[PDB]
mmCIF file of C-alpha atoms in Angstrom:
data_model
loop_
_atom_site.group_PDB
_atom_site.id
_atom_site.type_symbol
_atom_site.label_atom_id
_atom_site.label_comp_id
_atom_site.label_asym_id
_atom_site.label_seq_id
_atom_site.Cartn_x
_atom_site.Cartn_y
_atom_site.Cartn_z
ATOM 1 C CA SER M 1 101.769 121.730 73.845
ATOM 2 C CA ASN M 2 101.248 125.360 72.897
ATOM 3 C CA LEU M 3 99.178 127.523 75.211
ATOM 4 C CA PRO M 4 95.508 128.413 74.635
ATOM 5 C CA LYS M 5 95.685 131.454 72.394
ATOM 6 C CA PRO M 6 93.606 134.431 73.653
ATOM 7 C CA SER M 7 90.818 134.548 71.092
ATOM 8 C CA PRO M 8 89.024 137.779 70.078
ATOM 9 C CA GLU M 9 85.301 138.544 70.410
ATOM 10 C CA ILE M 10 84.752 138.125 66.643
ATOM 11 C CA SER M 11 86.629 136.478 63.768
ATOM 12 C CA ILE M 12 86.262 136.981 60.005
ATOM 13 C CA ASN M 13 87.628 134.651 57.330
ATOM 14 C CA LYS M 14 88.557 135.602 53.756
ATOM 15 C CA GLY M 15 76.428 143.172 57.013
ATOM 16 C CA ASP M 16 79.175 142.918 59.611
ATOM 17 C CA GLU M 17 81.079 146.208 59.960
ATOM 18 C CA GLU M 18 84.739 145.260 60.212
ATOM 19 C CA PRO M 19 87.457 147.948 60.061
ATOM 20 C CA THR M 20 87.800 149.053 56.435
ATOM 21 C CA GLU M 21 89.685 152.182 55.465
ATOM 22 C CA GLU M 22 93.017 152.779 57.289
ATOM 23 C CA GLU M 23 92.906 150.221 60.119
ATOM 24 C CA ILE M 24 94.207 147.073 58.402
ATOM 25 C CA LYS M 25 97.093 149.232 57.169
ATOM 26 C CA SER M 26 97.772 150.461 60.709
ATOM 27 C CA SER M 27 97.733 146.919 62.096
ATOM 28 C CA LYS M 28 100.088 145.772 59.327
ATOM 29 C CA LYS M 29 102.467 148.629 60.155
ATOM 30 C CA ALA M 30 102.299 147.809 63.870
ATOM 31 C CA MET M 31 103.016 144.113 63.270
ATOM 32 C CA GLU M 32 105.882 144.814 60.866
ATOM 33 C CA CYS M 33 107.558 147.373 63.134
ATOM 34 C CA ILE M 34 107.047 145.489 66.418
ATOM 35 C CA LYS M 35 108.401 142.237 64.951
ATOM 36 C CA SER M 36 111.743 143.990 64.382
ATOM 37 C CA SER M 37 111.871 145.017 68.063
ATOM 38 C CA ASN M 38 112.894 141.455 69.093
ATOM 39 C CA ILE M 39 110.404 141.385 71.955
ATOM 40 C CA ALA M 40 111.257 137.736 72.690
ATOM 41 C CA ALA M 41 114.958 138.430 73.320
ATOM 42 C CA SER M 42 114.242 141.914 74.715
ATOM 43 C CA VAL M 43 114.169 141.168 78.461
ATOM 44 C CA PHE M 44 114.005 137.350 78.658
ATOM 45 C CA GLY M 45 116.737 136.680 76.082
ATOM 46 C CA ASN M 46 119.922 137.302 78.044
ATOM 47 C CA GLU M 47 120.467 136.207 81.642
ATOM 48 C CA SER M 48 121.324 139.631 83.114
ATOM 49 C CA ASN M 49 117.693 140.795 83.566
ATOM 50 C CA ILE M 50 116.514 137.709 85.497
ATOM 51 C CA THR M 51 115.941 138.703 89.126
ATOM 52 C CA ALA M 52 113.397 137.987 91.853
ATOM 53 C CA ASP M 53 112.003 141.534 91.645
ATOM 54 C CA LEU M 54 110.852 140.887 88.076
ATOM 55 C CA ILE M 55 109.249 137.595 89.125
ATOM 56 C CA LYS M 56 107.396 139.225 92.026
ATOM 57 C CA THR M 57 106.119 142.000 89.756
ATOM 58 C CA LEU M 58 105.101 139.430 87.122
ATOM 59 C CA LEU M 59 103.096 137.388 89.613
ATOM 60 C CA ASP M 60 101.521 140.205 91.639
ATOM 61 C CA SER M 61 100.283 141.946 88.482
ATOM 62 C CA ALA M 62 98.421 138.837 87.268
ATOM 63 C CA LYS M 63 94.675 139.437 87.110
ATOM 64 C CA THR M 64 92.714 137.179 89.491
ATOM 65 C CA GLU M 65 89.171 138.555 89.267
ATOM 66 C CA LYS M 66 86.560 137.972 86.573
ATOM 67 C CA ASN M 67 84.628 140.717 84.788
ATOM 68 C CA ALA M 68 82.578 141.014 81.608
ATOM 69 C CA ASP M 69 85.418 142.394 79.480
ATOM 70 C CA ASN M 70 88.308 140.262 80.780
ATOM 71 C CA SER M 71 86.566 136.856 80.539
ATOM 72 C CA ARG M 72 87.578 136.771 76.852
ATOM 73 C CA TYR M 73 91.210 135.996 77.746
ATOM 74 C CA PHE M 74 91.437 135.040 81.448
ATOM 75 C CA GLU M 75 92.848 131.561 80.963
ATOM 76 C CA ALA M 76 95.441 132.441 78.338
ATOM 77 C CA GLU M 77 96.648 135.284 80.571
ATOM 78 C CA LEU M 78 97.003 133.139 83.693
ATOM 79 C CA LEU M 79 98.765 130.352 81.827
ATOM 80 C CA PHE M 80 101.030 132.962 80.206
ATOM 81 C CA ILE M 81 102.218 134.276 83.589
ATOM 82 C CA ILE M 82 102.734 130.780 84.988
ATOM 83 C CA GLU M 83 104.516 129.609 81.819
ATOM 84 C CA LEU M 84 106.932 132.528 82.079
ATOM 85 C CA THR M 85 107.539 132.335 85.824
ATOM 86 C CA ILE M 86 108.314 128.608 85.760
ATOM 87 C CA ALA M 87 111.007 129.280 83.148
ATOM 88 C CA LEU M 88 112.636 132.209 84.905
ATOM 89 C CA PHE M 89 112.525 130.286 88.197
ATOM 90 C CA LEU M 90 114.338 127.432 86.460
ATOM 91 C CA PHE M 91 116.927 129.991 85.313
ATOM 92 C CA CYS M 92 117.570 131.359 88.843
ATOM 93 C CA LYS M 93 118.159 128.772 91.593
ATOM 94 C CA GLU M 94 117.335 130.108 95.069
ATOM 95 C CA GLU M 95 115.360 127.822 97.393
ATOM 96 C CA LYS M 96 115.495 129.847 100.628
ATOM 97 C CA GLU M 97 113.012 132.643 99.798
ATOM 98 C CA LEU M 98 111.848 132.745 96.175
ATOM 99 C CA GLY M 99 110.471 129.205 95.946
ATOM 100 C CA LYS M 100 108.106 129.749 98.863
ATOM 101 C CA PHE M 101 106.692 132.933 97.326
ATOM 102 C CA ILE M 102 106.199 131.598 93.785
ATOM 103 C CA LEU M 103 104.714 128.326 95.062
ATOM 104 C CA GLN M 104 102.328 130.092 97.457
ATOM 105 C CA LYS M 105 101.163 132.526 94.788
ATOM 106 C CA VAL M 106 100.554 129.891 92.107
ATOM 107 C CA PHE M 107 98.700 127.721 94.636
ATOM 108 C CA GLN M 108 96.525 130.728 95.472
ATOM 109 C CA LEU M 109 95.964 131.145 91.725
ATOM 110 C CA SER M 110 94.894 127.516 91.269
ATOM 111 C CA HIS M 111 92.026 127.670 93.782
ATOM 112 C CA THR M 112 90.320 130.581 91.976
ATOM 113 C CA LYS M 113 86.773 130.111 90.725
ATOM 114 C CA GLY M 114 85.500 129.166 87.289
ATOM 115 C CA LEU M 115 88.439 127.453 85.560
ATOM 116 C CA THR M 116 87.863 124.875 82.835
ATOM 117 C CA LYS M 117 89.379 121.399 82.654
ATOM 118 C CA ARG M 118 92.152 122.185 80.153
ATOM 119 C CA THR M 119 93.544 125.141 82.093
ATOM 120 C CA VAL M 120 93.649 123.152 85.349
ATOM 121 C CA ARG M 121 95.371 120.240 83.591
ATOM 122 C CA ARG M 122 97.987 122.587 82.144
ATOM 123 C CA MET M 123 98.343 124.417 85.475
ATOM 124 C CA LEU M 124 99.030 121.292 87.539
ATOM 125 C CA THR M 125 102.279 120.284 85.793
ATOM 126 C CA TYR M 126 103.797 123.603 86.853
ATOM 127 C CA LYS M 127 102.965 122.706 90.459
ATOM 128 C CA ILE M 128 104.791 119.397 89.960
ATOM 129 C CA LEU M 129 107.785 121.274 88.548
ATOM 130 C CA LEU M 130 107.844 123.646 91.521
ATOM 131 C CA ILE M 131 107.655 120.819 94.072
ATOM 132 C CA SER M 132 110.509 119.163 92.173
ATOM 133 C CA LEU M 133 112.534 122.385 92.384
ATOM 134 C CA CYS M 134 111.531 123.399 95.917
ATOM 135 C CA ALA M 135 112.730 121.775 99.140
ATOM 136 C CA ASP M 136 111.273 121.621 102.658
ATOM 137 C CA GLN M 137 107.748 122.464 101.455
ATOM 138 C CA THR M 138 105.947 119.201 102.209
ATOM 139 C CA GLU M 139 102.700 120.887 103.301
ATOM 140 C CA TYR M 140 101.812 122.130 99.818
ATOM 141 C CA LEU M 141 102.543 118.674 98.405
ATOM 142 C CA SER M 142 100.146 117.302 101.023
ATOM 143 C CA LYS M 143 97.497 119.824 99.968
ATOM 144 C CA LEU M 144 97.979 118.870 96.313
ATOM 145 C CA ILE M 145 97.865 115.112 96.835
ATOM 146 C CA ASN M 146 95.045 115.017 99.411
ATOM 147 C CA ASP M 147 92.510 117.520 98.052
ATOM 148 C CA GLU M 148 93.297 118.388 94.433
ATOM 149 C CA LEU M 149 94.445 114.993 93.124
ATOM 150 C CA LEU M 150 92.547 112.333 95.087
ATOM 151 C CA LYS M 151 89.107 113.845 95.734
ATOM 152 C CA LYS M 152 88.818 115.575 92.348
ATOM 153 C CA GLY M 153 87.604 112.742 90.105
ATOM 154 C CA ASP M 154 85.560 114.234 87.273
ATOM 155 C CA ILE M 155 88.402 116.411 85.975
ATOM 156 C CA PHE M 156 91.054 113.649 86.162
ATOM 157 C CA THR M 157 89.881 110.517 84.319
ATOM 158 C CA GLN M 158 91.228 107.583 82.309
ATOM 159 C CA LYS M 159 91.405 109.586 79.083
ATOM 160 C CA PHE M 160 93.600 112.326 80.565
ATOM 161 C CA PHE M 161 96.152 109.856 81.925
ATOM 162 C CA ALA M 162 96.055 107.968 78.609
ATOM 163 C CA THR M 163 97.649 110.848 76.683
ATOM 164 C CA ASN M 164 101.263 112.007 76.526
ATOM 165 C CA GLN M 165 100.309 114.626 79.129
ATOM 166 C CA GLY M 166 99.732 111.849 81.660
ATOM 167 C CA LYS M 167 103.158 110.322 81.066
ATOM 168 C CA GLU M 168 104.753 113.572 82.255
ATOM 169 C CA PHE M 169 102.790 113.137 85.495
ATOM 170 C CA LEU M 170 103.751 109.470 85.783
ATOM 171 C CA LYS M 171 107.452 110.245 85.225
ATOM 172 C CA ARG M 172 107.922 113.444 87.239
ATOM 173 C CA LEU M 173 105.868 112.586 90.327
ATOM 174 C CA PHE M 174 107.453 109.120 90.436
ATOM 175 C CA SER M 175 110.988 110.498 90.105
ATOM 176 C CA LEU M 176 109.994 112.780 92.997
ATOM 177 C CA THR M 177 110.373 109.669 95.182
ATOM 178 C CA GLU M 178 114.093 109.608 94.335
ATOM 179 C CA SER M 179 114.553 113.076 95.883
ATOM 180 C CA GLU M 180 116.723 112.966 99.000
ATOM 181 C CA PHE M 181 114.576 115.297 101.177
ATOM 182 C CA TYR M 182 110.911 114.309 100.492
ATOM 183 C CA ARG M 183 111.346 110.513 100.520
ATOM 184 C CA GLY M 184 110.421 109.767 104.134
ATOM 185 C CA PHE M 185 107.164 111.716 104.127
ATOM 186 C CA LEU M 186 106.271 110.188 100.759
ATOM 187 C CA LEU M 187 106.544 106.633 102.075
ATOM 188 C CA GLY M 188 104.892 107.681 105.333
ATOM 189 C CA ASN M 189 101.804 109.105 103.637
ATOM 190 C CA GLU M 190 98.645 107.003 103.317
ATOM 191 C CA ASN M 191 96.866 108.970 100.579
ATOM 192 C CA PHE M 192 99.720 108.524 98.084
ATOM 193 C CA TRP M 193 99.277 104.754 97.973
ATOM 194 C CA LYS M 194 95.493 105.204 97.784
ATOM 195 C CA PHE M 195 95.907 107.365 94.675
ATOM 196 C CA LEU M 196 98.450 104.900 93.283
ATOM 197 C CA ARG M 197 96.090 101.942 93.586
ATOM 198 C CA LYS M 198 93.256 104.044 92.140
ATOM 199 C CA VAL M 199 95.247 104.972 89.025
ATOM 200 C CA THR M 200 96.705 101.441 88.843
ATOM 201 C CA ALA M 201 93.308 100.117 87.713
ATOM 202 C CA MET M 202 93.771 102.073 84.463
ATOM 203 C CA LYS M 203 94.625 99.693 81.632
ATOM 204 C CA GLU M 204 97.373 101.745 79.987
ATOM 205 C CA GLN M 205 99.394 102.831 83.044
ATOM 206 C CA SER M 206 100.003 99.328 84.448
ATOM 207 C CA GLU M 207 103.212 98.529 82.527
ATOM 208 C CA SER M 208 104.866 101.841 83.419
ATOM 209 C CA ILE M 209 103.721 101.324 87.028
ATOM 210 C CA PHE M 210 105.656 98.071 87.145
ATOM 211 C CA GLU M 211 108.605 99.801 85.466
ATOM 212 C CA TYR M 212 108.806 101.929 88.601
ATOM 213 C CA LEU M 213 108.420 99.131 91.152
ATOM 214 C CA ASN M 214 110.746 96.573 89.548
ATOM 215 C CA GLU M 215 113.340 99.322 89.296
ATOM 216 C CA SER M 216 112.844 100.695 92.794
ATOM 217 C CA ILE M 217 112.962 97.352 94.592
ATOM 218 C CA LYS M 218 115.861 95.976 92.511
ATOM 219 C CA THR M 219 118.308 98.875 92.863
ATOM 220 C CA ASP M 220 117.858 99.028 96.644
ATOM 221 C CA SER M 221 115.514 98.033 99.469
ATOM 222 C CA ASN M 222 114.944 101.693 100.375
ATOM 223 C CA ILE M 223 111.259 101.686 99.371
ATOM 224 C CA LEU M 224 110.510 98.781 101.709
ATOM 225 C CA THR M 225 109.475 99.729 105.249
ATOM 226 C CA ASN M 226 107.228 98.057 107.821
ATOM 227 C CA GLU M 227 104.572 100.784 107.859
ATOM 228 C CA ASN M 228 104.859 101.074 104.055
ATOM 229 C CA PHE M 229 104.590 97.373 103.261
ATOM 230 C CA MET M 230 100.904 96.393 103.278
ATOM 231 C CA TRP M 231 99.600 98.810 100.635
ATOM 232 C CA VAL M 232 102.484 97.943 98.302
ATOM 233 C CA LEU M 233 101.528 94.271 98.512
ATOM 234 C CA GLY M 234 97.945 95.212 97.701
ATOM 235 C CA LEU M 235 99.203 97.238 94.749
ATOM 236 C CA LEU M 236 101.089 94.228 93.431
ATOM 237 C CA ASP M 237 97.964 92.129 93.979
ATOM 238 C CA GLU M 238 96.126 94.453 91.613
ATOM 239 C CA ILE M 239 98.848 93.857 89.015
ATOM 240 C CA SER M 240 98.135 90.163 89.493
ATOM 241 C CA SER M 241 94.374 90.779 89.383
ATOM 242 C CA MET M 242 94.415 91.795 85.713
ATOM 243 C CA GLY M 243 94.174 89.396 82.783
ATOM 244 C CA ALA M 244 91.109 88.132 80.941
ATOM 245 C CA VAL M 245 91.786 88.888 77.232
ATOM 246 C CA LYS M 246 96.725 89.515 74.968
ATOM 247 C CA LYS M 247 99.320 91.510 76.940
ATOM 248 C CA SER M 248 98.290 91.199 80.600
ATOM 249 C CA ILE M 249 99.442 87.571 80.578
ATOM 250 C CA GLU M 250 102.750 88.871 79.229
ATOM 251 C CA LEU M 251 102.852 91.539 81.980
ATOM 252 C CA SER M 252 101.743 90.083 85.319
ATOM 253 C CA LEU M 253 104.251 87.199 85.190
ATOM 254 C CA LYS M 254 106.949 89.733 86.063
ATOM 255 C CA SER M 255 104.858 90.917 89.023
ATOM 256 C CA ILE M 256 104.468 87.312 90.177
ATOM 257 C CA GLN M 257 108.232 86.811 89.929
ATOM 258 C CA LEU M 258 108.814 90.045 91.857
ATOM 259 C CA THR M 259 106.465 88.914 94.631
ATOM 260 C CA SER M 260 108.346 85.618 94.839
ATOM 261 C CA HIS M 261 111.716 87.405 94.857
ATOM 262 C CA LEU M 262 110.674 89.924 97.532
ATOM 263 C CA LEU M 263 110.895 87.352 100.352
ATOM 264 C CA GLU M 264 114.674 86.816 100.356
ATOM 265 C CA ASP M 265 116.115 90.114 101.620
ATOM 266 C CA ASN M 266 117.248 91.412 104.996
ATOM 267 C CA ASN M 267 114.960 90.002 107.667
ATOM 268 C CA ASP M 268 112.291 92.734 107.808
ATOM 269 C CA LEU M 269 109.415 90.603 109.141
ATOM 270 C CA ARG M 270 107.806 92.436 112.056
ATOM 271 C CA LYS M 271 105.796 89.730 113.870
ATOM 272 C CA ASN M 272 103.598 87.982 111.270
ATOM 273 C CA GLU M 273 103.939 89.657 107.869
ATOM 274 C CA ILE M 274 105.478 86.975 105.620
ATOM 275 C CA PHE M 275 102.050 85.312 105.793
ATOM 276 C CA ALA M 276 100.706 88.288 103.819
ATOM 277 C CA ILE M 277 102.827 87.437 100.777
ATOM 278 C CA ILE M 278 102.164 83.709 101.230
ATOM 279 C CA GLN M 279 98.432 84.502 101.273
ATOM 280 C CA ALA M 280 98.874 86.633 98.152
ATOM 281 C CA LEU M 281 100.656 83.839 96.280
ATOM 282 C CA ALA M 282 97.963 81.405 97.421
ATOM 283 C CA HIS M 283 95.317 83.816 96.120
ATOM 284 C CA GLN M 284 97.054 83.775 92.729
ATOM 285 C CA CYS M 285 96.005 80.126 92.359
ATOM 286 C CA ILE M 286 92.323 81.234 92.286
ATOM 287 C CA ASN M 287 92.687 83.160 89.006
ATOM 288 C CA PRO M 288 90.778 81.599 86.092
ATOM 289 C CA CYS M 289 93.376 81.473 83.318
ATOM 290 C CA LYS M 290 95.439 78.302 83.050
ATOM 291 C CA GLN M 291 98.877 79.868 82.550
ATOM 292 C CA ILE M 292 98.745 82.310 85.468
ATOM 293 C CA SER M 293 97.482 79.666 87.911
ATOM 294 C CA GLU M 294 100.078 77.128 86.764
ATOM 295 C CA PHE M 295 102.895 79.642 87.162
ATOM 296 C CA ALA M 296 101.494 80.621 90.569
ATOM 297 C CA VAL M 297 101.676 77.063 91.897
ATOM 298 C CA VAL M 298 105.085 76.596 90.246
ATOM 299 C CA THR M 299 106.617 79.704 91.823
ATOM 300 C CA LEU M 300 104.993 78.796 95.153
ATOM 301 C CA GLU M 301 106.797 75.448 94.979
ATOM 302 C CA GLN M 302 110.013 77.187 93.911
ATOM 303 C CA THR M 303 110.064 79.776 96.734
ATOM 304 C CA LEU M 304 108.949 77.653 99.703
ATOM 305 C CA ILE M 305 111.583 75.021 98.854
ATOM 306 C CA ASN M 306 114.543 77.414 99.175
ATOM 307 C CA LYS M 307 113.683 81.028 100.018
ATOM 308 C CA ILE M 308 112.931 80.819 103.750
ATOM 309 C CA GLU M 309 114.955 79.606 106.737
ATOM 310 C CA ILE M 310 113.202 77.785 109.575
ATOM 311 C CA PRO M 311 115.102 78.742 112.770
ATOM 312 C CA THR M 312 115.292 82.447 113.661
ATOM 313 C CA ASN M 313 113.902 85.069 116.048
ATOM 314 C CA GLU M 314 110.401 84.890 114.509
ATOM 315 C CA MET M 315 109.680 81.508 112.866
ATOM 316 C CA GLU M 316 109.935 78.878 115.590
ATOM 317 C CA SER M 317 109.186 76.058 113.131
ATOM 318 C CA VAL M 318 107.580 75.228 109.788
ATOM 319 C CA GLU M 319 104.206 74.253 111.303
ATOM 320 C CA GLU M 320 103.159 77.855 111.938
ATOM 321 C CA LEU M 321 104.425 78.801 108.465
ATOM 322 C CA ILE M 322 102.115 76.289 106.754
ATOM 323 C CA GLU M 323 99.309 76.816 109.320
ATOM 324 C CA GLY M 324 98.996 80.598 109.089
ATOM 325 C CA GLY M 325 98.256 81.796 105.578
ATOM 326 C CA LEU M 326 97.307 78.974 103.218
ATOM 327 C CA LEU M 327 94.196 77.770 105.080
ATOM 328 C CA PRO M 328 92.728 81.309 104.995
ATOM 329 C CA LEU M 329 92.431 80.613 101.251
ATOM 330 C CA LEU M 330 90.098 77.737 102.202
ATOM 331 C CA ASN M 331 88.542 79.638 105.138
ATOM 332 C CA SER M 332 85.642 81.020 103.077
ATOM 333 C CA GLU M 333 79.202 76.822 93.485
ATOM 334 C CA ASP M 334 82.713 78.277 93.518
ATOM 335 C CA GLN M 335 83.774 76.958 96.925
ATOM 336 C CA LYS M 336 83.191 73.239 96.308
ATOM 337 C CA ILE M 337 85.327 73.119 93.142
ATOM 338 C CA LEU M 338 87.882 75.701 94.339
ATOM 339 C CA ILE M 339 89.218 73.593 97.222
ATOM 340 C CA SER M 340 90.597 70.820 94.952
ATOM 341 C CA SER M 341 93.538 72.892 93.634
ATOM 342 C CA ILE M 342 96.607 73.233 95.870
ATOM 343 C CA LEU M 343 96.567 70.182 98.167
ATOM 344 C CA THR M 344 99.665 68.715 96.458
ATOM 345 C CA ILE M 345 101.963 71.541 97.609
ATOM 346 C CA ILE M 346 101.985 70.436 101.266
ATOM 347 C CA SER M 347 102.855 66.829 100.433
ATOM 348 C CA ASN M 348 105.551 67.987 98.008
ATOM 349 C CA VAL M 349 107.118 70.604 100.294
ATOM 350 C CA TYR M 350 107.118 68.608 103.550
ATOM 351 C CA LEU M 351 109.484 65.929 102.114
ATOM 352 C CA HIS M 352 112.603 68.111 102.064
ATOM 353 C CA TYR M 353 112.102 69.412 105.601
ATOM 354 C CA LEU M 354 111.463 65.808 106.668
ATOM 355 C CA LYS M 355 114.851 65.006 105.171
ATOM 356 C CA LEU M 356 115.976 67.824 107.445
ATOM 357 C CA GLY M 357 113.650 66.188 109.989
ATOM 358 C CA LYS M 358 113.085 69.113 112.367
ATOM 359 C CA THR M 359 109.520 68.167 113.378
ATOM 360 C CA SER M 360 108.293 66.139 116.367
ATOM 361 C CA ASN M 361 106.615 62.733 116.522
ATOM 362 C CA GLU M 362 103.019 64.027 116.799
ATOM 363 C CA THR M 363 103.812 66.942 114.457
ATOM 364 C CA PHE M 364 103.441 64.692 111.403
ATOM 365 C CA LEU M 365 100.235 63.100 112.657
ATOM 366 C CA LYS M 366 98.570 66.460 113.431
ATOM 367 C CA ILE M 367 99.888 68.037 110.232
ATOM 368 C CA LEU M 368 97.971 65.164 108.623
ATOM 369 C CA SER M 369 94.810 66.447 110.325
ATOM 370 C CA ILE M 370 95.633 70.035 109.322
ATOM 371 C CA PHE M 371 96.059 68.682 105.770
ATOM 372 C CA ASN M 372 92.379 67.725 106.298
ATOM 373 C CA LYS M 373 90.240 64.609 105.770
ATOM 374 C CA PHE M 374 86.958 66.293 104.853
ATOM 375 C CA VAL M 375 85.831 63.324 102.643
ATOM 376 C CA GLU M 376 82.149 63.179 101.508
ATOM 377 C CA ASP M 377 83.331 64.041 97.961
ATOM 378 C CA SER M 378 84.030 61.938 94.882
ATOM 379 C CA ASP M 379 87.250 63.835 94.146
ATOM 380 C CA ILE M 380 88.589 64.239 97.689
ATOM 381 C CA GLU M 381 87.938 60.643 98.805
ATOM 382 C CA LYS M 382 90.136 59.273 96.020
ATOM 383 C CA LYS M 383 92.602 62.170 96.215
ATOM 384 C CA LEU M 384 93.553 62.337 99.886
ATOM 385 C CA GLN M 385 94.346 58.694 100.682
ATOM 386 C CA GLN M 386 96.355 58.166 97.496
ATOM 387 C CA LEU M 387 98.244 61.422 98.104
ATOM 388 C CA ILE M 388 99.103 60.672 101.748
ATOM 389 C CA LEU M 389 100.130 57.095 100.898
ATOM 390 C CA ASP M 390 103.549 58.612 100.056
ATOM 391 C CA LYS M 391 104.290 59.001 103.793
ATOM 392 C CA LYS M 392 105.017 55.293 104.248
ATOM 393 C CA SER M 393 107.757 55.276 101.593
ATOM 394 C CA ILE M 394 109.801 58.152 103.073
ATOM 395 C CA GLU M 395 110.440 56.309 106.371
ATOM 396 C CA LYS M 396 113.624 54.858 104.850
ATOM 397 C CA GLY M 397 114.826 58.396 104.074
ATOM 398 C CA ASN M 398 115.728 58.864 107.756
#
């Protein structure tokens, strides 16, 4: 939007002693004659006057100390210098020397005392623009993301990110990941994903958040990395965590599908990390709404049938795969009724690998124990025996 105009110390619409006799006439003459000067196109119009000396003199001359007289128009002045210098730095591309100086000076300007919320909000987008333009200046990005963005909470709230101002943040900083010289540090950083999961809880920004992730994972697997992985999974879990009212039901299904799809890629499992996504998908079955839980069990059935291979460097067999993650769901009024949900998936999924028949002779009989015989319940006593009665029929399969 337009900048904050520097207001005067008094305003009169149309006793107070305003200028009367010859002063309005003088101001009219000054306005009429200075408008014809073409001050806008005087120095900044053509491209021949744009040089680093002008930018240095613009920035060094900016007032950075408060007094009684100059507090009338401090903020409009500072935003005026930054608004100019961002434009004339866009005009002249030189990353070796000039970018360091302009970025250092504006960062020194930002930390000055006694700035309101609006001026800081307007100031920050210019920092984003400079980091987009600059290269090999990761330290100032670290200072911005660690101290100014994360810790500062009162200034940056839900309502600020809700506006069209916030969308500029959510587009520019996210497209910063596509830059070919800041990518590695950006994935390597811890605080970035902390800030991402903090802002992900906002109701409005969730859809756009997914519009990044579904793009970034689909075009290439560049975002994925072993040190990067865990937080990203947690972020997707938060996308699954929403939904009680109706658009979240329309939204999080795509996140569920993305989590299911993320398994089948190049084999990037470190030692035991696939169990994280299996645990996540199992946790989806705890959600209260009918549709999300039904789709969770359905996609669980659809991915474990097809989207993992048994023999490789890491997975010795299927027993560890079904023993690792799912029972942590049952490890912990809610607990008694919660356990009666997902017991069918083991009996359904074992059949196809039994047709493959990779398991040993006691492996079935101890997988039966791992499938559990807790009894002492009206539901479970009828459920378990009738469910495991299917094992006798499949003997003719092999």
